[PDB]
């Protein structure tokens, strides 16, 4: 049985490995999400997962793909630690408290609470990472920061500690939607496969269920994700509120804009989840048997 130290250390490393591997997908998602906000005279247009990544690598280099990565690693550490140390206690309070099974309701509430606390703790990392991923020298917007800690100090000094929590409520709602949609969709798909006997219950079945649920959650959260990215990236004063940003997006680009960066978002969710699962299991097994 993995101890807490090996679980916490394994979760941190698996999350960080998955993040460094799938970070170009996240950067491509952000670039696709902020593309139509401000018109650009440059002929550099982002279209697709590999199209966006290749355009970024050609016009800005490889290190521009991993811009804000230290912020992403900090977020991964805090989120993984909060999962390993808090999702356990709330879940076991809901299950063993009434001696009930981990029903979907208990799972929904546990994920909601853990995700909310994690979003609140890791919001400054999200602000810094999103602004660094979206900043570019080629579209007429002057980059505000040179790196993760430059961004940290500049945001803190010029706009307060509170300004490091900009976009918490969109991120919090997006977390709620991701969690609820993913859990409901996975249950519905797995019950369809197991009752209609469309597929046998082996890990291929759970993989199809999880992939379908991840895509459904990504599609369901895409409007909030686009609005959250644009709001977090915006400098002070551009948007009166988060509904203001959403309404401007709607009236100036339409319902399709709310799904900008949908393919990179879903690919990063799926690849991150599989990489973290594999790395986490292998790492905690080797640390426990070491």
């Amino acid at each position: 049985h993995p101890t807490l130290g090996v679980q916490l250390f394994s979760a941190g490393i698996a999350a960080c490995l998955a993040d460094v591997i799938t970070f170009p997908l996240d950067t491509a998602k952000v670039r696709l999400q902020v593309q139509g906000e401000c018109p650009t005279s440059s002929v550099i247009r982002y279209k697709g997962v590999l199209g966006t990544i290749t355009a970024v690598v050609k016009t800005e280099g490889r290190m521009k793909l991993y811009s804000g990565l230290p912020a992403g690693l900090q977020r991964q550490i805090s989120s993984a630690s909060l999962r390993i140390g808090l999702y356990d206690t709330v879940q076991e309070f809901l299950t063993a408290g009434k001696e009930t099974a981990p029903s979907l309701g208990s799972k929904i509430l546990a994920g909601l609470t853990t995700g909310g606390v994690a979003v609140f703790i890791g919001q400054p990392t999200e602000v810094v990472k999103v602004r660094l991923q979206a900043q570019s020298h080629l579209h007429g917007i002057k980059p505000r920061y040179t790196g993760t800690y430059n961004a940290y100090r500049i945001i803190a000094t010029t706009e307060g500690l509170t300004g490091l929590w900009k976009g918490t409520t969109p991120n919090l709602m997006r977390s709620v939607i991701i969690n609820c949609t993913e859990l409901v969709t996975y249950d519905l798909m797995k019950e369809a496969f197991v009752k209609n006997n469309i597929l046998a219950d082996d890990v291929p079945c759970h993989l199809v269920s999880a992939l379908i649920a991840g895509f459904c959650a990504t599609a369901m959260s895409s409007p909030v994700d686009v609005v959250k990215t644009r709001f977090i990236n915006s400098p002070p004063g551009q948007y009166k509120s988060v509904p203001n940003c959403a309404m401007k997006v709607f009236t100036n680009e339409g319902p399709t804009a709310f799904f900008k960066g949908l393919v990179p978002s879903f690919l990063r969710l799926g690849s991150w989840n599989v990489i973290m699962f594999v790395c986490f299991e292998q790492l905690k097994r080797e640390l426990s048997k070491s």
Partner: nanobody
Amino acid sequence: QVQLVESGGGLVQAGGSLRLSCAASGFPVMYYNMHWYRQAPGKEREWVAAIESTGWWAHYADSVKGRFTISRDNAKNTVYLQMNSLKPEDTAVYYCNVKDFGWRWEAYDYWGQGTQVTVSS
């Protein structure tokens, strides 16, 4: 009932200045980017300038950048085009434009009637 009304055009000597105004009506202008186009006869309508919903960014055609400035006031529902060092090739009908995208496949263009700007040489 979208309605854009341009004004302020007229006959000006080359090198002179002119401020075009656009009174917008029938829609919440605080949410829409506003555009200035122009068209001279024998030519196609040329995009001139664009301004963000609250004036956060402004973009110009390369032919007018520096000479033309686009400006906004949402408390008066008005969009402004200041034109300086005017030159005879700027003689055209200038059009206020709203691209209302909304629940649509493509954006829908709402135009004004245009105001005529004639530059004498």
